[PDB]
Symmetry: C3
Subunit: 124 residues, 3 copies
């Protein structure tokens, strides 16, 4: 018989950052930081609820637009002290982006109206 | 000053297809696709040249929205191999992008028995 | 309250191989090896000076055209004796290729007039 492996991921990701700040406060912050750092993009990075890896101390990042998703994985891996064997996946609107995509490209395609890009992370 | 030659070049014949007749395969694939419409049936086999272990079970049902990269960890934990060992997956002898979904690979590449065949190897 | 993470690369990279071997000699060698091994591609692999990881002993490789970037990463990591936790990225003309790209496709796109493909590697 077949062996079932893996589970679908619910699209129900809520972000503490969106819960803790009204829209216009977020938009004002995102607009101002895009003016101050025009070669970076503001990204909210938060743990998916079924993730079985560590928490991030900070959620609000400023990442160079020209860095790839792959480069960003390593920078985040280092902050959650992941063992090399441990998985790490980013999801934007519940979809894992290609590792060769740049953060600027992802931001242009998927930032919200508050000027933030939202990324959930998980080990599965 | 001399060139250093490394790596080896790579169609694979899956022993599963020799072990089970086509019509029994197809009947099963059609049945399981109706039973689990949000999963895809996959046959996973080791490439003969791989120096890592074989899987006990070959037949898996994976969520269509799962990626190859996610699938990698679900299968790697079921193989006997060392941390130092590589693991690569092939569909029709090509390594897919890690962000490709299993449902997309199934839609493009499932055979006429409605299974997706995936090989794995080390390096 | 933003956390700056990662740095942009300014794209500066020279290859010691080119400094040390005249163009005409490089071109004749690359032409000759492509005739003899038509299913392999000649690659020069060098560490970016800014990288804080180990250097390679050998820089001139001859790899199957159908080998992927991912397969080549695994071999080069081993040759450098990289810690599992350290990152390794390849750059071709300052762009990280997709891990599923083949070396033959990168060679076709980016080999120079000496018939070599030049790859830099770094930890970031």
């Amino acid at each position: 018989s077949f062996t079932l492996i893996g589970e679908a991921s619910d699209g129900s990701m809520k972000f503490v950052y969106k819960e803790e700040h009204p829209f216009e406060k977020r938009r004002s912050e995102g607009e101002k930081i895009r003016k101050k750092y025009p070669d970076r993009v503001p990204v909210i990075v938060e743990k998916a609820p079924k993730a079985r890896i560590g928490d991030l101390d900070k959620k609000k990042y400023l990442v160079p637009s020209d860095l790839t998703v792959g480069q960003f994985y390593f920078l985040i891996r280092k902050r959650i002290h992941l063992r090399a064997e441990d998985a790490l996946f980013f999801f934007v609107n519940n979809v894992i982006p290609p590792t060769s995509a740049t953060m600027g490209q992802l931001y242009q395609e998927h930032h919200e109206e508050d000027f933030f890009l939202y990324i959930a992370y998980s080990d599965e």
